Paper text:
A 26 kD nuclease from [name] used in the current study had resisted crystallization inspite of extensive purification and crystallization space screening. Here, we report the successful crystallization of a nuclease employing a reductive methylation protocol. The new contacts dramatically altered the crystallization properties of the protein, resulting in crystals that diffracted to 1.2 Å resolution.
Electron density for only 9 amine nitrogens out of 32 (including the N-terminal amine group), could be unambiguously assigned as dimethylated. Forty new intra molecular (NZ)CH...O contacts in the range 3.2 to 4.0 Å were generated because of the methylation, of which 25 interactions were between 3.2 to 3.8 Å. The methyl carbons of all the dimethylated lysine residues were involved in the formation of multiple new symmetry-generated intermolecular contacts. The structure reveals 96 new symmetry-generated inter molecular contacts in the range 3.2 – 5.0 Å involving the (NZ)CH group and 28 of these inter molecular contacts are of the (NZ)CH...O type and in the range 3.2 – 4.0 Å. Analytical ultracentrifugation analysis and thermodynamics results revealed a more compact protein structure with better solvent exclusion of buried Trp residues in the folded state of the methylated protein, assisting crystallization. Interestingly, we found that the chemical modification resulted in a decrease in the mid-point of unfolding in both GdmCl and thermal denaturation, which corresponds to a decrease in the free energy of unfolding, Δ GU,H20, of 18 ± 3 kJ/mol. The only short contacts – a 3.0 Å link between the CH2 methyl carbon of MLY221 and a phosphate oxygen, and a 3.1 Å bond between the carboxyl oxygens of E36 and the MLY221 methyl carbons, resulted in the distortion of the conformation of the MLY221 and the glutamic acid, suggesting steric clashes due to the excessive closeness of the methyl carbon and the oxygen atoms. The methylated protein lost its ability to cleave DNA (results not shown).
Residue numbers in the entry: 11 to 242
Write the structure that this text describes.
Amino acid sequence: IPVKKVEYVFIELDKMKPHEQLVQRELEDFIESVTGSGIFWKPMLLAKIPGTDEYLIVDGHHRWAGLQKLGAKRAPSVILDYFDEGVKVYTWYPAFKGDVNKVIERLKAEGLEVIEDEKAEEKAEKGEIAFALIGEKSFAIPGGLEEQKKVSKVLDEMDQAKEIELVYYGLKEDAKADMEKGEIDYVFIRKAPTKEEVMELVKRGEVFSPKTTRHVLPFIPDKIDVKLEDLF
Ligand code: NA
């Protein structure tokens, strides 16, 4: 898709509402980058929540949260019509380099079930279980939203402890191709939400587990060049 210079507008951070949780490494990396470079270059993508003067964060949770942590006030933003057909939503695929037996033990310690099930991926994609865990073997992790959050918490902890390397793939096919090559061991598969589900969630004040949405527009917003000091 084409890159397009789009006009941004500064929006106050306190008007932005998240729809998903954070990955600690991504939060800390953003803070390190923006303070080290002094430049904010990737605009927030926002959509107004109907009946309010608040915005759904479409893209930029880690940027918003990092700026809030730094004590900033505003961020450059592109305002979208969320239900325009050009706005599409997919998901991310958490994958790891590491020992699946250690991951499974940690998942079970958090009260999750991990069940060998050759239909796990199909069930996950239908929204019937929290995640499928797919590699040499195929496991179902039953549940829904709360169980997805428990899985993600374990992964973030193991990422921080360097027990695994935790990476997020945009495309399931890419994760599977890298597993074939021996670059990753297992991938977690869940169903993407619909846009209607995202907006319903933010309207009730709730959030998904980290990296639940991956939004795509008909164009790529060109990068911008805003000084960090201008956000305060
Ligand atoms: Na997202």
